[model samples]
Target chain A: VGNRYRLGNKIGSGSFGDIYLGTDIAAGEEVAIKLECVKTKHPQLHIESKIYKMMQGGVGIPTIRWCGAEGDYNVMVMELLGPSLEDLFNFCSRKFSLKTVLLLADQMISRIEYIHSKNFIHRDVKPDNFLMGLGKKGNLVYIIDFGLAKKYRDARTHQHIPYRENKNLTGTARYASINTHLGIEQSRRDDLESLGYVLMYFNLGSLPWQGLKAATKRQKYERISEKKMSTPIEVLCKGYPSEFATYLNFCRSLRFDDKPDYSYLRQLFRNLFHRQGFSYDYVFDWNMLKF
Target chain B: MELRVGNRYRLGNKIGSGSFGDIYLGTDIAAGEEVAIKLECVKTKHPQLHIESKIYKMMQGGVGIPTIRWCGAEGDYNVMVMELLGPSLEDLFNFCSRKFSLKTVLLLADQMISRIEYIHSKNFIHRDVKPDNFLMGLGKKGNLVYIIDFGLAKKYRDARTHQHIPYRENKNLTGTARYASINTHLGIEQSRRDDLESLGYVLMYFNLGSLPWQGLKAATKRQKYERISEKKMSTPIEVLCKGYPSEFATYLNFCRSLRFDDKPDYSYLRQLFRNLFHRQGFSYDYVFDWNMLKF
Candidate 1:
């Protein structure tokens, strides 16, 4: 235990760092804990704590209970949510119905919209970086793992960060935007574009660029980039609803400095959910399949 | 971080260092504010932390300076707790491959000059005006530039009578020689004019990637300073500022022709660049060229 929070069994892989189930004795509730080695050449837990503090009161952002050092470790104990979207995706055979996809999109858009309003972009916005809430808030989606987060605008001055080119790709290339693969600096639009690919992957079972044969990691990423560039939105959303194509096209057409219309995008999904005769009862496909 | 100061300040990793001290990131335990603790060995023959503390206190009366919260002997070394800031311009310079666009140079020049003017307003001259001594800001003032490392600062005018330091020479060369004024290399006593000239050299160094005096093959420090001064004087203003616009060359010439006690027309020099910027239709937006793909 780091003071009051008792560390439980390890959770997911520590690709970024080790995370464990934790319990706050004072509050008598379970929590999630992220730990970084004190001697890590470039420590990130402290920075991750600061980002949480900035967007704490907003929706989807985690509530940080405690952040400090314990012996040779830097630890942060915070509010714990349910399994990641990646966990649920695979749990349901890696395919989600249009109702479930539309339901998830409404919350996903809100999560990123709130983060962007706080002047930062969740550079890693794939399924694993998102999680479902627990208890009464099970339907809600929470954005986490800000290890790759970047501030795309000034906190107060409201000036957008200067646009540039020839940047290294960030996040997993499988879920990265095509422009990100081409080495362009990411902004608000890039995050939304990445979300488009995630939504399509859930609906189509797998993206067209998935499992492409290439020799090296760099070449694989390049092949994915070329495929994405050559594949039209119409083809990507061929058997799916036309709304998916419209959403992807809108995100792709945004300029470097253009402001994103979050409300309209949320409306696009909400309208789809209503038109499909779906209700906001928080009853998802996983529940119906099991029950 | 935990109670390195017995629950007062928690010391963390070292962010930077100088010949005399190492700076570490520390947390003020009470409110959890991130502060920098620059530690200097008290056992050394000469300790500069005391001088740094004194200068920080004097400059704190003005804006754009990090506040010196606490300073004293702590254990084996003399430590100072102050506000932590962003990277130095030198860090950004090297990050950008030692080169900056003219737009970045001109915008940075605007703030660097104002900071120097503020120092002179305090009746002191920052004898060391280089890229390493100037840092970018963080938090609410992220777009602004800040001045640091006042170990070479000196009072140029008497506090009470307001009398200037008499014209003198044979003084030891002060500041980083790469961006030091030609007069400083010539062993002349530094003043407000020298500070402005050093900034001129600093901006040109940023614009040109490297100065002509860099990497000189010399056996001794004095010999190196000697060659740098000679090389600086021999390089004509017209020849030095060839590829770029004429304002930089004009800025160097203005600082060169000033009398020993003549006041520097800081506003005029800023406006000279500002006029060129206006004609080129550049806004006062602080979008620097150094904000690159590193993020």
Candidate 2:
């Protein structure tokens, strides 16, 4: 029932489905085909494919090739991307140097800005969802995994949704924002806050909440959430450059409906780029390992 | 008419056209980078361009292959944007108005062999091997040589066992007639040996200015091709090598001697060039000999 795609090996697996490396026979291109069972409890496949279609041609979004049902499963084919940032972090021994984190921060900020332009917030932002390109495009970072992404504004009315509290946790606990753990509806600011945690994780290798001992999953999450709120971002970013604290502070200052000045945030990292005497060449840490 | 692909790459001046499609210089607006966008009609149903994109995907991390930026279908055409490369070796050869010097040819040989070895290691054969497909990098990447256009590449291994495909006969002729191996002329299925054999022709052409069978005449197509293959096989290595390094002849000899199923000694071939570089006291600097010459 694959029709045109010749599915290959299973490259990755997630809660919703399995990702396969496949060949689009008609287009002669490699694609990552995500397959989900039709009988699954969570049928987010349709929604994720819709988001990919809407974000097509947008920066940092993977191109969607085809999406439809295949016998017992729902399948979607997208551009084959490279390893995730989490994989890269582990590859570099779980921690990134100051220069490397700064390089990534520049691109990640631009990517989140692009995502917010379409009126959606990535509800779930973590290292595992952001990937680097494989080849000549290795320097390019891409944001993926739209399964938890949601619109913070009303589509038909063009009005911001009312903020609500006492909501359930919907994203990864490790990088979820404090507001997210406090059971509040996520807004664009929540996405930025999660990104702050990701940047800190890249620089520190692990968060202060990591390995918190507890009797149950809920207890562990509650302890981690308490640690995240109790510890100031400055303390979390200590022994590092002041930019990390500056970045976290800026994210914290964003209101629910406030439109972020993306250029201003980008200039912060650009200032560091100038200070380091780095040119606009697409050089990164992995470039040293390969070509 | 102007066209944009991926709603980001604005197509500009037409650069060139090949058997598959037309290539245009384009600009990626989002990244503010220059790219080469290749446009081909999807209705025409030619699979060469598609096959090429697949090969580029497979060779992503390998050295010496151009990186693909984006690929998508637009209206009635299939479009792909990739890293823009510099002039082909053929273009450079014509610009020089003479054969390449021994040093330039040696550097080119080293890179070309390494690239071929990488492709072979992946269990694929570049059915077409010629100077036209090898291009130098542009600007800061100018020193690098990138092998481009993989429209004729095909896998030679099984998916399950990774075993080599069995030898076969009576396959249709593939690749350029000028650089085709004797086995190709006899309608035999191609393998890594044929690729190496074609490379031998390319290296010889680079050094000697021309091959003896360049313009052989005959009444029929078969007769002409037969004469070309005969000349290719009969030409002695002594005549071909002439003033170049003996390693060149040794390399060509190894290629012609290989059977369809035999694995090539890629390391030995690479070591031959490395030994030559060491003997000549030349650093592996990518600077070509022509860089010093004023056009």
Candidate 3:
């Protein structure tokens, strides 16, 4: 049976596509496959594969398997995990332990730093894109999907994308980094901010763009345009360590001209990890090390 | 009974509800992820499932609706896992529709057209192009807009020349009748032209809160369609819009020419939209930033 491996059940769905669980026949391993019905439009898949290939061997991110073609569908296969970070949030109570959250962030940053050092920017980073590995040790984490990422050799010479204002088109708009949200040129620093939000979300349940209900695109734009709109990490994050909250608040204060440099983020995470009584595991050591 | 749905999708607050279904800010139990679950009643036929599948398949990856994270039909329930959006169009309008600045209008129309063009290129017609469908991206930075709700959406030929929307089957009457073109009223097969006409109405709506042929009082379906035919409302609309910047006014005139022969020339429409909407001052050589003018 060319069905070498059976396509089990549906795992997830999005506007552009659906993801499923499939087994790697030759390897007999479980993998998540993102099946995009319309393959031609998502030329970015090629971009993602290229970037993934460029960053192979790094830790915390899912490794891209083959970009296999199945009839009309184009599928992207990666190591499958039981649940995404979003799923873990539901698994827990309303709040996530500061330690676990920090571990996730530290791992994420190490991976991002690796990706950035290679001149690539992960434009999309949110809880949903995070997946937990298999087994007790495997439970570390993996960053899924590079659909919106772009390789940046240097920001000084790069130009903004035409027509669409945003440099990074692929992302959950709610958690977009300031530069990505503004349609301005994106840099490694902006990607760091996205990580900061998820890290912050561990303590402050809601994001800066939390409230307001707009029905039309015009209306949504105007409402978000108001100056007051921003992450409420300050008021809501009162109980958490000031440093963690302060880091998020700093990210919120981020403007087009002044984004918090990665050095600040790296140090910030280092402190947070230590404060949580946990040693930070670098992404180069992709596997999670128990305290 | 509790709405126990999806794999680890914990239903939370009711963000909004409509005839189609309820939208809830949900938590993906498995991933600890927060997502907006758009739920619609599933009748015995499961017709909505088919339509959603088709639309999702066609517009996959376009800069339109919140990305469909997942879709499924279990029992008689249909759920669409979509990117949780910030607010509806009406929410933003309450904040700043009074000004309706030319720059704002240009950006708004440009985005709307970009979305429509994307849809047209896909050979699909988002028959319903009302304000409700255009959702703003999440957060206060609200420069992003994603079109939602394709319950009554349909597919058409890709660049195939068809003079009219073929109405033979069910008469493509599946959209907000108020935005339907006169030809649409004839039950003609929906074409890009019909979408264009609805888009014209949308542009007018952007400038003037309610639809041009608006009535606060409840009216029967027949009365509503009848009110649309009378050109009486056009004049007041024209007068109120007299102060609109000339470029937009020019675009407005083209929108008014609903008929094929009378419609504003495509070349002119492209140039006007390019200058005011897409292109930043039409300076061919240097790349001008359009995001700075975002809503």
Candidate 4:
């Protein structure tokens, strides 16, 4: 706490840390602080803080205010944000209009692209990993939970990390990339591929592979990957505009060594959004339910 | 000159008042953890803080009941410290815009019934059963709802003899009028049935936002209670739980049908809502409506 912050009740949790509502006693400002033991399932919080530091200074990137170790635990304090898209979706009756999903897509790509520019990749991307800001910054979306993030290239060398195989799944099963499930190393394409599934989930109210039955975690994830591999992008994005199918196809089309054309991916959705004559107001579908 | 009770619990702001006691949010200085400290004047003839602590001690280890940290008197005031909990269901109801989804209500119904059942099992009845008496827990226990405020709790049966108290009349209303059973309003002696019936009203209140007898502008407290009693008696189980699932009405019917001496079938009451929750496609994942709070 550095004699500045005091912890409150638990507000959320991550794979490695428990999140608490903290207060800056001197400034009387509310902030979020994450706590984890030095020893962990993946030994995260320290590296998670490092990733936040690198990912800072970009829009939709949560700023890390403080990070330190005390006793056997590591603590990180950052600016508090609004609810996650998953929480908002449930509040909105588990459905999001195409307008909302497309708006989210624009920011989602921008966030992943910025992470790529930082020479690291967010290994986990899901609705829970993205959150909205509060008050005047309310419309702004943020990318968070970098517990699984890793350097895809040396910061100064500009050389991509060598491809590896036989990797365990690193994200939510419902929204993980097909490549990640197949023991392939995740890259920018994998994040975009996972983002496609999230957008489809928000629009279609579910994914075709959801609620897959299996006896264990490993078996369940395996079935989900097989389902994702089998379902054509056209059928997955059925009843939606063709842009979504094209977006999925483009993400799946990227090779391990190919650099993602982030600008092209963004404009693809932006063009379809404009073609539909939908206005950009950041008034999300969940917001419409309030007033 | 800040107040420090139990020495380690440093009192902060006054957060609430309950049953002749004023509650403050306090920090356990050693652990840096927060707790709720309830204070009462030991000089009062009807001092309740110590009695409430005793009730908590008796009901310890029961699901949905909070564990008491410490209870003792310092100077002329008696104080009891307990774990700090989340917002009341009433606050959560307001957060959800005055009404809860059927899924939320059913989720709550299961825990609420279990809480009452726990109290009854201890040979006691929570006379003051209301939204305010029940608070949600924090952290790993966040999904669990806790029953609090045992200042008015009564032992309705003999703990050792396992014998029931003789039914009697001529009793005044002992709980909040809005959610109390009609039998309690009519000055009938309350038992296990009274607790369940009050819970039914609470479930309906969460869904409908307000009972039909609410906002009655009577000249006196007695007049208001009389009017509420009459409305509650006149309103059919059908009308009180209209538009919602029939499980609610059926719940009230079962509670009302229980005889004074009979033991309540708590499992059956819980099953009604558990089945309804499943039929409606909601998982009993304990993700409450407040979990989706707009704030």
Tens-place lDDT per residue, model 2, B117-209, is 889887799888999888787657777778877767889876467788888888877677789998999998898998998998899899888
Q: Give each model a TM-score.
A: 0.53, 0.52, 0.47, 0.53
Residue-wise C-alpha lDDT for candidate 3, range B89-205, written one tens digit per residue: 554454453335445555566677777777766667777777667766643334666777767666666346633344353463557766776666666666666676676676666
Record all residue pairs in model 2 with backbone atoms less than 3 Å apart, i.e. clashing.
Answer: none
Off by over 4 Å in 3: A1-291, B1-4, B17-19, B97-99, B139-142, B158-173, B216-219, B231-240, B246-249, B252-270, B274-295
The 10 consecutive residues of candidate 1 chain B with the worst lDDT sum are B1-10
**Candidate order by decreasing lDDT:** 4, 1, 2, 3
CAPRI grade of model 3? incorrect
A84-157, model 3: which lDDT tens digit per residue?
67755655544676667666766777777777766666777788877766533254577767776766665465
Would you list the rank order by TM-score, best first? 1, 4, 2, 3
The lDDT of each candidate is: 0.80, 0.78, 0.60, 0.82
In angstroms, what RMSD does candidate 3 have relative to the true structure? 22.2
RMSD of 4: 23.1
lDDT of 2 at A66: 77
Q: In model 2, which regions exceed 4 Å deviation?
A: A26-28, A134-136, B1-295
Worst 10 residues of 4 chain A by lDDT: A282-291
TM-score of chain A of 2: 0.92
